[PDB]
Amino acid sequence: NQIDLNVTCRYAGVFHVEKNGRYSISRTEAADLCQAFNSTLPTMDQMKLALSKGFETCRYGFIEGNVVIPRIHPNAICAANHTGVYILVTSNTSHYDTYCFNASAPPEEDCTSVTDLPNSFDGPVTITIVNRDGTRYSKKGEYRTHQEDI
Ligand SMILES: CC(C)N(C)S(=O)(=O)N1CCNC(=O)C1
């Protein structure tokens, strides 16, 4: 019973989380997942400030109200070459990655690794945080509060 959470650098407290190496998070799961990192789904304003500090990914993820990809450099296979916070307009499907916002993180680029899941609750799942540099942190617990996400 294992969940892998790949996480990024934080930029003005905003970071990206990919679960089990594929688009697999619902909107309800995303809010609960960010809560386990003492975080919330970013507002569009929080995500735009993160973008301005150096944040970009090539993956769709939830923010408050939309599913987006922050882009700095145009890349044909990432948000169809767009720059800025690209907003997903048309999709048949409901599962993506998520972004999270932690107000206590540094104001600009923080590319240190994540070494905790501070607000997970008791549960049976081995949850592993995987950093981009491969370093890992694991803990037994649960973060999903909605049965349909389990
Ligand atoms: C921004 C996230 C990824 N964190 C660095 S953390 O979840 O590990 N954590 C550290 C302790 N207290 C917190 O609010 C957050």
Curated annotation (Swiss-Prot):
It comes from Mus musculus (Mouse). The lectin-like LINK domain is responsible for hyaluronan binding. Glycans are attached at residues 6, 38, 81, 92, 102. Disulfide bonds join 9-111, 34-100, 58-78. Expressed in the intestinal epithelium. It comes from the Eukaryota. N-glycosylated. Hyaluronan binds at residues 22, 59-60, 86. This is CD44 antigen. Interacts with PKN2. Interacts with TIAM1 and TIAM2. Interacts with HA, as well as other glycosaminoglycans, collagen, laminin, and fibronectin via its N-terminal segment. Interacts with UNC119. Interacts with PDPN (via extracellular domain); this interaction is required for PDPN-mediated directional migration and regulation of lamellipodia extension/stabilization during cell spreading and migration. Interacts with RDX, EZR and MSN (via FERM domain). Interacts with EGFR. Interacts with CD74; this complex is essential for the MIF-induced signaling cascade that results in B cell survival. Cell-surface receptor that plays a role in cell-cell interactions, cell adhesion and migration, helping them to sense and respond to changes in the tissue microenvironment. Participates thereby in a wide variety of cellular functions including the activation, recirculation and homing of T-lymphocytes, hematopoiesis, inflammation and response to bacterial infection. Residues 13-102 form the Link domain. It is found in: Cell membrane; Cell projection, Microvillus; Secreted.
